[PDB]
């Protein structure tokens, strides 16, 4: 029920950023894992896919789905975003509230290259 | 948890008629004195005698005989 | 015979259609209903009115999980 409730909770924000057409930094946390991307303004193509399911990220972090791993993923994804040349995004908390793993990962992205 | 609005909540020591001391939490704190619990309750042996309906033929015969 | 009223009709309904140019600032539709919405490159006002931010030959389509009629924009 959590997934459907969260998707309905996030429909307004996700459609808002899709229609605004500013490329949005997307998150979706789970208790055990998490996947972090950078998605196109309309949503038809991603830019960088970095997650705690990757080999190096998984083996360099003691626990996959925890806030410390979320912060490490934020650092890594924003630095790879700088490497590819990503500068401007408009945040999308994806229906959650801006606190916890999402807040720490977002602060990591701010430090490591994304302006928000 | 709200530590302010709710009353005090801690372990107590409570005793019953059958002497069983329950290491359970209560809202009062001080020791509690009860009367009957579910162990000494007459739910398994007293309920059938609670019917006490008796028999009219039995009472007639016992009171007197022809 | 006491009930013969009607509105001072407000002249609602689609005014500037798909296939008509949008001058800088122009609306597409005036309506009291969101029967035709703000899809791609379009916006809304205060009193159920929607004025498009983007010019050119307008695009009519139907979208939404609710089978809704929108107003989108082409490349003119």
């Amino acid at each position: 029920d959590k997934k459907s409730a969260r998707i309905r909770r996030a429909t307004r924000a996700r459609r808002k950023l899709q229609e605004l057409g500013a490329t949005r930094l997307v998150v979706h946390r789970t208790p055990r894992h998490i996947y972090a991307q950078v998605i196109a303004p309309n949503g038809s193509e991603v830019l960088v896919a970095a997650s705690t399911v990757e080999k190096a990220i998984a083996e360099q972090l003691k626990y996959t789905g925890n806030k410390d791993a979320a912060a490490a993923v934020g650092k890594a994804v924003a630095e790879r975003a700088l490497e590819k040349g990503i500068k401007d995004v408009s945040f999308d908390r994806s229906g959650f509230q801006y606190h916890g793993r999402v807040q720490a990962l977002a602060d990591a992205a701010r430090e490591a290259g994304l302006q928000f | 948890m709200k530590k302010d609005i709710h009353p005090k909540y801690e372990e107590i020591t409570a005793s019953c008629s059958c002497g069983n001391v329950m290491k359970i939490r209560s809202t009062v704190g001080h020791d509690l004195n009860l009367d009957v619990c579910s162990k000494c309750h007459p739910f398994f042996t007293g309920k059938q005698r609670d019917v006490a309906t008796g028999g009219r033929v039995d009472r007639f015969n016992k009171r007197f005989n022809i | 015979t006491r009930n013969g009223r009607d509105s001072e009709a407000k002249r609602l309904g689609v005014k500037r259609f798909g296939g008509e140019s949008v001058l800088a600032g122009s609306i597409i539709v005036r309506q009291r209903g969101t029967k035709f919405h703000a899809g791609a490159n379009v916006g809304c006002g205060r009193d159920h009115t929607l004025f498009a931010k983007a010019d050119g030959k307008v695009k009519f389509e139907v979208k939404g999980p609710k089978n809704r009629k929108f107003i989108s924009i082409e490349a003119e």
Binding site: - | R25, D35, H41 | -
Partner: protein
């Protein structure tokens, strides 16, 4: 939480032996406790409302929430949005310990006890039975209460059927019959 310990240690094994569910957690689970009191006199005196709320807060480990009038009713003479009902909802360790308190204190203390109905399951296993007084409870003092209230414990289960709810409660030694 001796009831929690019993549930996690011996009750789970007993119900495994009973039901033979190939899934370990397929057994229905009790997941909350609800204690209700209905006061019509809220409109007459919000002050007695507050007194009853304080009594409920004393008897339960948590202060009750005051609900409002969902929809206005003419025959009951209460206005919509005016608070008319009170409730408490508990979980987990609170559930286990307060349930032990119930079974080992209130049940004998119920005046004229004759056993509780076995068909009190709300049709799907939700045990629902009422007691008329507040003095049958060990924290609500007899000598300090001026007006006696009532309450009905109603406990929602995840049982697919009233049969499995009754199996759970009888295995847990619930006082039905």
């Amino acid at each position: 939480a001796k009831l929690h310990d019993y549930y996690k240690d011996e009750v789970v094994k007993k119900l495994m032996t009973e039901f033979n569910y190939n899934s370990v957690m397929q057994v229905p689970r009790v997941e909350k406790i609800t204690l209700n009191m209905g006061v019509g006199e809220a409109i007459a005196d919000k002050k007695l409302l507050d007194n009853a709320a304080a009594d409920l807060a004393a008897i339960s480990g948590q202060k009750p929430l005051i609900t409002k009038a969902r929809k206005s009713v003419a025959g009951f003479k209460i206005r919509q949005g005016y608070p008319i009902g009170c409730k408490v909802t508990l979980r987990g360790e609170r559930m286990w310990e307060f349930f032990e308190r119930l079974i080992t204190i209130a049940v004998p203390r119920i005046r004229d006890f004759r056993g509780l109905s076995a068909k009190s399951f709300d049709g799907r296993g939700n045990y629902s039975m009422g007691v008329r007084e507040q003095i049958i409870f060990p924290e609500i003092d007899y000598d300090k209460v001026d007006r006696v209230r009532g309450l009905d414990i109603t406990i929602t289960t995840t049982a697919k059927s009233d049969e499995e709810g009754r199996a759970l409660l009888a295995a847990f030694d619930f006082p039905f019959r």
